[PDB]
Paper text:
The hybrid-type MEs consist of an N-terminal catalytic domain (ME domain) and a C-terminal activity regulating domain.
To obtain a more physiologically relevant state structure, we added the cofactors NADP+ and MgCl2 to EcMaeBapo solution prior to data collection and determined its structure (EcMaeBholo) at 2.73 Å resolution. While the cryo-EM map of EcMaeBholo clearly shows the PTA domain, the map around the ME domain is unclear. Furthermore, in 2D classification of EcMaeBholo data, the ME domain was ambiguous. These results of the cryo-EM map and 2D classification indicate the flexibility of the ME domain of EcMaeB. Consequently, the catalytic site of EcMaeBholo including cofactors could not be modeled well although we added NADP+ and Mg2+ to the sample. Therefore, we had to conduct further local refinement of the ME domain dimer to observe cryo-EM maps of NADP+ and the Mg ion.
Author numbering:
A (entry chain B), B (entry chain A): 2 to 440
The structure:
Amino acid sequence: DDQLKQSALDFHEFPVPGKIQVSPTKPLATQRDLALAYSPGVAAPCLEIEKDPLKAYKYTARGNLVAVISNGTAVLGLGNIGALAGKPVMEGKGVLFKKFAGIDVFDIEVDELDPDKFIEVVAALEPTFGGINLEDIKAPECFYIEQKLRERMNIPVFHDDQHGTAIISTAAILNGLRVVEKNISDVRMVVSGAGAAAIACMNLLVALGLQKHNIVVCDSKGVIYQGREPNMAETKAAYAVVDDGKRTLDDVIEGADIFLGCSGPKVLTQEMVKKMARAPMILALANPEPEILPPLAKEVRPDAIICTGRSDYPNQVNNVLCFPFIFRGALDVGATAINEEMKLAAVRAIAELAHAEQSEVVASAYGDQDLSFGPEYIIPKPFDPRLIVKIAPAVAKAAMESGVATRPIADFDVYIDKLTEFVYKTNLFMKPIFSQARK
Amino acid sequence: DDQLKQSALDFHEFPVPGKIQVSPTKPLATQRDLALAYSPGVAAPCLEIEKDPLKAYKYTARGNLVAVISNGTAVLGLGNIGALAGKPVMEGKGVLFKKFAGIDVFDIEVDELDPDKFIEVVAALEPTFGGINLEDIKAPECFYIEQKLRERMNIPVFHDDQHGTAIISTAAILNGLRVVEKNISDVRMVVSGAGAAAIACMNLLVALGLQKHNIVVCDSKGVIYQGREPNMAETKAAYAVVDDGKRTLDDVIEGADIFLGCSGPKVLTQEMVKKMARAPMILALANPEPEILPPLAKEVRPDAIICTGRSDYPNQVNNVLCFPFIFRGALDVGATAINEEMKLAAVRAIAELAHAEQSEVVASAYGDQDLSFGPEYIIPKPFDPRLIVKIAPAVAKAAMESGVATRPIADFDVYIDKLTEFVYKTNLFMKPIFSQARK
Ligand SMILES: NC(=O)c1ccc[n+]([C@@H]2O[C@H](COP(=O)([O-])OP(=O)(O)OC[C@H]3O[C@@H](n4cnc5c(N)ncnc54)[C@H](OP(=O)(O)O)[C@@H]3O)[C@@H](O)[C@H]2O)c1
Ligand SMILES: NC(=O)c1ccc[n+]([C@@H]2O[C@H](COP(=O)([O-])OP(=O)(O)OC[C@H]3O[C@@H](n4cnc5c(N)ncnc54)[C@H](OP(=O)(O)O)[C@@H]3O)[C@@H](O)[C@H]2O)c1
Ligand SMILES: [Mg+2]
Ligand SMILES: [Mg+2]
């Protein structure tokens, strides 16, 4: 860790402080440019925005501006390091929002810990941005903050932990159901740690067509029992099941078709993977340590699908796969909210990007792409330059079918051409060389 | 005004909508680069910042980040347009910070117009920034907001509509008595329209040795003197003169020596300036129309020292003339607040430049610079490319003297060389050519 520690600190300590900077997009080097960008000329756009508040997107950078707002209570895996301690991390995601999406990001870091104070602070900042990206707020404050902001602010509010990797998890589950012949209705699914990502994973599966009479949730206290605690809250113990014993998760896994373990490592053992249905779809989604190492489950059950947050083994589920392109589509369509139908469209696009892959000027040498749709390849790789081309025009299209768009765009072919032009100027061809060299 | 209004509506939005973008300053090519910016690497600066918050200025952009926070209730001269309608102006100011001082700006705008909830929003936003630049908050709540914030946050909070003219004008006065061989001990004062940019001015002048009994404040309703109204209005009783029956601005002159005025249309006539004592010191600071129309008054009395705010005539007072550069001081010294010993150290630094100008690679032709200290050269031109070299180290030294800094600067020669090198790579040589060819 010492080598990584020294490598990361030197990354942006010495050359310039920080990994982010603000530069004009206007050519101003003479007079009559400073006389209309400020003082007697900049008052003309304000008059137009004064009478037509929807004209702001044309004259200002609101339509390309999202905010990574955080109180710094649960940052990455660090925990409650505190406000400004997560200041680099926010900037880091801002960088991604540019490179992969061309979205300018402010990295606001609210100091308040009270949920209501945070809600008020972020809601007051509505005119500045065109979308909120609440990040690293510890549960259960995250749920309250996101729901209140979505119901109050008339701007896209999209939490990353909540329904971020949830999108990719839903896409992976759908593609797994497509791989092994198992209709989603007949799938009996198990949850571990119903919170943060998992709580939205289950909701997205339900929306896509998973029925709650086949779902079960088990946590450190055990299964969600109808009588485990009088505080029968819907935040965690929703759609609960009667006690009927089932103290441990061993019998829960007995007759299970998915694992979807997002929270809580090492909760899955070899015998338990053995006690599964015809084809399990273990989703070990714990970044620190996966719930079960993929090779062990592969040895125990040759015919299975395993997804892991780490990139060591295939079917890697990364947050970067989803949010920048979701926000790209929502902003470009001029949407006012990221509802469930946009998320469903994104899930469909990610699923269809996995079994409709050809050409894309495959590197004749190097690379070793060698990916074909199967148990190994369920979801597109984190950096496919064909995601933004697929996620963004679908999410935008969802706005067209939902009446939440304020700037409808015609000729989606032109939008496709613009996105392909954007991805033509951002290509990471050195990581295929590294991957090929390592083998 | 379609030659001006329309030409400003489409400033540069045709190629890219809106000024200002947040662009990465990192090597943005390889996957390893997007591993010390997020996930396994970005967690390394976080520990150091958590252990010692002062490390952030090394790892984050806080040492070069200010925030132009505003609720948009008095924008330029438009008025109470709103937080959103004032968005371009902020961006305008932002580019100035990146053009003349290289300061990154987040153009945050608060939707809440209440004069007490604004403070909480900004105080919560404190960790994001290294300085605050409140602008377009209308009077009298601007003073309240600034005073409340300066006691709460531990970073420089610096208003725009009060200190914007309180410094340069003071320098003008500090320079005016130089050419009229007077002393601040006995000079009499007149103030018109004690508003945002007026009532805060004389305080700084008091720090230079202008006794309060020589100041007479005036307003639209005649004269602000103790006794005119049964209730003495707040923040104006300090300089309110005793009751003497002086109910009009036409009589309170009594051969005064200064006419600092921050109001709307003209208040003085030819005989009004005539009533002044020898060597008047008019400071008509109204932006739309001059309060005196200098040349006419210059015809009434010779040896006049009229100072205005419009660039058409000499002795022009501009906010950009001082405001980035003083910030460039504090941010480069780690100041926790802006005292009156740095707000006044940036007064003796811009007043010195008027009679300390020579060489500086004078344009052998063109330009028609022709500046010599005297009745028509009181303050440096709004863009002497040399203000940032004279103001910023002066403010930094005043910070280190007052015990308000956190990262004291070493031997100043390196600092002056750095500021000069920044000056060299930012030149506006086309402006003198325009000013010479037009005449
Ligand atoms: N795309 C990604 O790579 C990605 C995205 C999101 C999350 N994750 C990972 O998912 C995990 C959870 O996310 P989080 O940061 O939101 O953590 P968290 O809030 O602590 O986890 C959610 C819940 O899981 C439970 N839990 C914790 N440890 C457990 C254990 N050993 N066994 C069973 N339940 C346990 C806790 O409730 P009880 O203590 O009552 O059980 C907690 O309320 C982290 O490891 C995170 O890195 C990865
Ligand atoms: N750097 C610059 O050159 C610069 C910067 C900012 C502002 N300004 C100028 O300063 C003025 C306002 O700026 P601000 O926002 O700082 O102050 P403000 O809050 O607008 O207050 C201006 C004051 O002027 C008074 N006033 C208005 N009309 C008047 C009239 N006809 N006769 C006498 N007094 C009158 C008002 O007094 P009552 O409250 O009694 O009406 C008010 O208190 C404008 O003229 C503006 O162009 C110049
Ligand atoms: Mg985070
Ligand atoms: Mg202003």
